[PDB]
Design a protein around this ligand. Structure first.
Ligand SMILES: CCc1cc(-c2c[nH]c3ncc(-c4cn[nH]c4)cc23)nc(N)n1
Length: 273
């Protein structure tokens, strides 16, 4: 079992309500991990014990390159430590903001791995419920690494405003289709630069979401547009990739992906941004 004195803590890699992720180097081996530190009392006072328990249960069952791994967990008298994979290139959102918008190849590659990752995840019966470009990170080799499993559900919660789905703003029920909506939202953002639904405040965004109030830029890849129109359907049972639509097969079979080779994506050279 690992201890805090076994590490050299560095910069903070992201904060949160109940957590802070710190860059930590392991002394004996010199490997760098991103440690999520959570204070036991703030968790108890705020009834988050089922949310932390779940995260650890969820992460301990992922074994795929497109997800961040949990290497160890240890604790002291006041804090919990979940040692996680360190993704050197950080959030995908940054690369979008720095290049403005991805070319068709870059959108095809990254959309494919995101699409590939959700097929493994949903294949296991786990739902992210908070998928966004701030959770999709990039490793040394520039492959995606999906994190933030605190709000994950194994088949009560509502994620980040801009990537929420109509069903959540109505029924109060998230299914795999909630992830496929976020996916639809993230595609738009890769081609266009900005999320599809944008407004002055959360209420105006929610009202713009439920009315499907969004319009594609005049220079949007047509195949990518048609795919976005297919994921961004108000009716959750009519969403490409969902089980009522016969799953990932047809999503994976969509024209936008004609040249993609799904089998060894993690072994492929990512394109230059
Ligand atoms: C939402 C904060 C958060 C972050 C992470 C995380 C795990 N490994 C990481 N490696 C690098 C970075 C990073 C971000 N910017 N620059 C580097 C973040 C992470 N994990 C959880 N669960 N949450």
């Amino acid at each position: 079992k690992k201890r805090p004195e076994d590490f050299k803590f560095g910069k903070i890699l992201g904060e949160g309500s109940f957590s802070t992720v710190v860059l930590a180097r392991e002394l004996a081996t010199s490997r760098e991990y991103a440690i999520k530190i959570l204070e036991k009392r703030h968790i108890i006072k705020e009834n988050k014990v089922p949310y932390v328990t779940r995260e650890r249960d969820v992460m301990s069952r992922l074994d795929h390159p497109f997800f961040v791994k949990l290497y160890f967990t240890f604790q002291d008298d006041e804090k919990l430590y979940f040692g996680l994979s360190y993704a050197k290139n950080g959030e995908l959102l940054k690369y979008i903001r720095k290049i403005g918008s991805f070319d068709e190849t870059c959108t095809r590659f990254y959309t494919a791995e995101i699409v590939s990752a959700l097929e493994y995840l949903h294949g296991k019966g786990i739902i992210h419920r908070d998928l966004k470009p701030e959770n999709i990170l990039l490793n040394e080799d520039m492959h995606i690494q999906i994190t933030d499993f605190g709000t994950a559900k194994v088949l009560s919660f509502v994620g980040t405003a801009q990537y929420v789905s109509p069903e959540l703003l109505t029924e109060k029920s998230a299914c795999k289709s909630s992830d496929l909506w976020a996916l639809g939202c993230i595609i738009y953002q890769l081609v266009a630069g900005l999320p599809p639904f944008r407004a002055g405040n959360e209420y105006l965004i929610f009202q713009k979401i439920i009315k499907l109030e969004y319009d594609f830029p005049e220079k949007f890849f047509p195949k990518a547009r048609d795919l976005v129109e297919k994921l961004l359907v108000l009716d959750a049972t009519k969403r490409l990739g969902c089980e009522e639509m016969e799953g990932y097969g047809p999503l994976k079979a969509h024209p936008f992906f004609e040249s993609v080779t799904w089998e060894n994506l993690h072994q492929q050279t990512p394109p230059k941004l």
